[PDB]
Amino acid sequence: PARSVVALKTPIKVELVAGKTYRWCVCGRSKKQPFCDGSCFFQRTGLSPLKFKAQETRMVALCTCKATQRPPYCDGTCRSERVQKAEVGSPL
Ligand code: FES
Ligand code: FES
Protein backbone atom coordinates (compact mmCIF):
# COMPACT_ATOMS: atom_id res chain seq x y z
CA PRO A 1 0.00 0.00 0.00
CA ALA A 2 0.98 3.65 0.04
CA ARG A 3 3.16 4.91 2.92
CA SER A 4 1.23 6.51 5.76
CA VAL A 5 1.82 10.20 6.42
CA VAL A 6 1.89 12.36 9.55
CA ALA A 7 -1.47 14.17 9.74
CA LEU A 8 -0.78 16.20 12.87
CA LYS A 9 1.73 16.22 15.71
CA THR A 10 -0.63 16.28 18.70
CA PRO A 11 -3.43 13.77 19.42
CA ILE A 12 -7.12 14.64 19.32
CA LYS A 13 -9.22 14.01 22.40
CA VAL A 14 -12.61 12.48 21.61
CA GLU A 15 -15.54 11.39 23.75
CA LEU A 16 -16.17 7.77 22.73
CA VAL A 17 -19.75 6.47 23.19
CA ALA A 18 -20.20 2.88 24.41
CA GLY A 19 -21.53 0.71 21.60
CA LYS A 20 -20.65 3.11 18.82
CA THR A 21 -18.50 1.99 15.90
CA TYR A 22 -15.55 4.17 14.90
CA ARG A 23 -13.08 4.09 11.95
CA TRP A 24 -9.66 5.44 12.84
CA CYS A 25 -7.68 6.97 10.01
CA VAL A 26 -4.55 4.88 9.53
CA CYS A 27 -3.25 6.60 6.37
CA GLY A 28 -2.86 10.21 7.61
CA ARG A 29 -4.85 11.73 4.73
CA SER A 30 -8.32 12.24 6.22
CA LYS A 31 -9.38 15.87 6.49
CA LYS A 32 -11.61 14.88 9.47
CA GLN A 33 -8.88 13.66 11.79
CA PRO A 34 -8.67 11.37 13.76
CA PHE A 35 -11.27 9.42 11.80
CA CYS A 36 -11.51 8.17 8.21
CA ASP A 37 -13.26 10.31 5.59
CA GLY A 38 -12.63 7.91 2.69
CA SER A 39 -9.44 9.54 1.37
CA CYS A 40 -7.72 6.15 1.76
CA PHE A 41 -10.17 4.88 -0.90
CA PHE A 42 -10.51 7.92 -3.19
CA GLN A 43 -6.71 8.09 -3.54
CA ARG A 44 -6.39 4.30 -3.98
CA THR A 45 -3.82 4.01 -1.21
CA GLY A 46 -4.41 0.30 -0.55
CA LEU A 47 -4.96 1.25 3.13
CA SER A 48 -8.23 1.11 5.01
CA PRO A 49 -9.35 2.44 8.42
CA LEU A 50 -9.00 0.57 11.71
CA LYS A 51 -12.61 -0.20 12.63
CA PHE A 52 -13.32 -0.44 16.37
CA LYS A 53 -16.36 -0.42 18.63
CA ALA A 54 -16.14 1.53 21.86
CA GLN A 55 -16.70 -0.63 24.92
CA GLU A 56 -17.19 2.24 27.39
CA THR A 57 -18.13 5.93 27.32
CA ARG A 58 -14.96 7.90 28.10
CA MET A 59 -12.56 10.56 26.80
CA VAL A 60 -9.62 9.06 24.86
CA ALA A 61 -6.73 10.53 22.87
CA LEU A 62 -6.54 9.20 19.30
CA CYS A 63 -3.31 9.22 17.32
CA THR A 64 -2.87 11.73 14.49
CA CYS A 65 0.89 11.33 13.80
CA LYS A 66 0.00 7.73 12.79
CA ALA A 67 3.15 6.33 14.43
CA THR A 68 1.64 5.03 17.69
CA GLN A 69 2.59 1.49 18.75
CA ARG A 70 -0.89 1.00 20.24
CA PRO A 71 -3.33 2.09 17.51
CA PRO A 72 -5.81 3.71 17.46
CA TYR A 73 -4.66 5.40 20.69
CA CYS A 74 -1.95 7.99 21.30
CA ASP A 75 0.94 6.36 23.12
CA GLY A 76 3.19 9.42 23.23
CA THR A 77 5.35 8.46 20.23
CA CYS A 78 4.33 11.94 18.99
CA ARG A 79 6.45 13.24 21.86
CA SER A 80 9.63 11.90 20.24
CA GLU A 81 11.97 14.30 18.44
CA ARG A 82 11.48 12.17 15.37
CA VAL A 83 7.76 13.03 15.16
CA GLN A 84 7.99 16.62 16.36
CA LYS A 85 10.54 17.38 13.59
CA ALA A 86 8.47 15.61 10.93
CA GLU A 87 6.59 17.54 8.29
CA VAL A 88 2.83 17.16 8.27
CA GLY A 89 1.74 15.44 5.08
CA SER A 90 5.03 13.51 4.73
CA PRO A 91 5.94 9.99 5.93
CA LEU A 92 7.88 9.73 9.14
S1 FES B 1 -8.95 8.49 5.28
FE1 FES B 1 -7.24 7.58 6.31
S2 FES B 1 -7.79 5.49 6.65
FE2 FES B 1 -9.53 6.37 5.53
S1 FES C 1 -0.51 11.46 18.17
FE1 FES C 1 0.46 9.60 17.42
S2 FES C 1 1.33 8.74 19.26
FE2 FES C 1 0.44 10.62 20.00
Swiss-Prot record:
The modification N6-succinyllysine is found at residue 20. Binds 2 [2Fe-2S] clusters per subunit. The modification N6-acetyllysine is found at residues 20, 51. GO terms for molecular function: 2 iron, 2 sulfur cluster binding; metal ion binding. It comes from the Eukaryota. [2Fe-2S] cluster 1 binds at residues 25, 27, 36, 40. Keywords: 2Fe-2S, Acetylation, Iron, Iron-sulfur, Metal-binding, Mitochondrion, Transit peptide. It is found in: Mitochondrion. GO terms for biological process: protein maturation. Its main location: mitochondrion. GO terms for cellular component: mitochondrion. Its cofactor is [2Fe-2S] cluster. [2Fe-2S] cluster 2 binds at residues 63, 65, 74, 78. Belongs to the CISD protein family. Monomer. Can transfer its iron-sulfur clusters to the apoferrodoxins FDX1 and FDX2. Contributes to mitochondrial iron homeostasis and in maintaining normal levels of free iron and reactive oxygen species, and thereby contributes to normal mitochondrial function. This is CDGSH iron-sulfur domain-containing protein 3, mitochondrial. It comes from Homo sapiens (Human). The lineage of its organism: Eukaryota, Metazoa, Chordata, Craniata, Vertebrata.
